[PDB]
Structures are given as structure tokens and as C-alpha cells.
């Protein structure tokens, strides 16, 4: 995303080690609602992954 003015958002900030799964719960929709005016979507790259030993 491109942003116009530097944005800081405390609601999005997470603890440093952050192992817990419920701490990471996301909706791109709501996130982009929050920052919409300053944020314009730009690049896209995606990869497909399946279970492995690690």
C-alpha cells in the first residue's frame, strides 16, 4: 500500500514475541476501512503451501 502521510496505529500494534494465535486475527476489509483514505493498494504476490515436517 502507498500512504500519503506517515501513519501510526496503536490498535494494530502487537506484542514483540507474539506467539498466541488469537492475538493474530485479521480482516483485510476492516483494516483497509480504518486506513482507507491514506492507503492505496499496490503490489500483489502470493504463494501456495501445504503441510511439511517442520
Amino acid at each position: 500500500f502507498k500512504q500519503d502521510k506517515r501513519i501510526d496505529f496503536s490498535g494494530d500494534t502487537r506484542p514483540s514475541p507474539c506467539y498466541q494465535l488469537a492475538q493474530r486475527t485479521f480482516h483485510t476489509f476492516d483494516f483497509y476501512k480504518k486506513h482507507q483514505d491514506a492507503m492505496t493498494p499496490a503490489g500483489l504476490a502470493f504463494f501456495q503451501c501445504r503441510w511439511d515436517d517442520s
Binding site: K2, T40, P41, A42
Partner: protein, 54 residues
């Protein structure tokens, strides 16, 4: 030639029950909400000429 004309016909929206209708074309027509980075500005005559020469 027959093959081509055939597919051309198969792509047009006929007024009778058709394959496309029952098989889930993913909504068919959708009016896109486009959140883009604005289309890169280019003069076409320059491109055309440079390409012809290349």
C-alpha cells in the same frame, strides 16, 4: 472455421436456457469496485511509431 464460429456463438448471451446459465459463471456480469493505482499516462503515437521502427 466451423469450430471458431461455433465458439463465437457459444460466448454470446442467448435468450434460451444455456450451459453458462446453470453452471455458475461466478455471478456473470459484476460491476467492479476498482481501487487502483491510477493507470500510467502514455502517449500512443510515440509508442506506435517507435514500435513500427523497431
Amino acid at each position: 472455421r466451423y469450430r471458431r464460429r461455433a465458439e463465437q456463438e457459444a460466448r454470446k448471451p442467448h435468450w434460451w436456457r444455456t450451459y453458462r446459465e446453470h453452471f455458475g459463471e461466478e455471478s456473470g456480469p459484476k460491476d467492479r469496485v476498482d481501487i487502483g493505482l491510477p493507470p500510467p499516462k502514455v502517449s500512443r503515437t510515440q509508442q506506435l511509431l517507435e514500435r513500427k521502427q523497431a
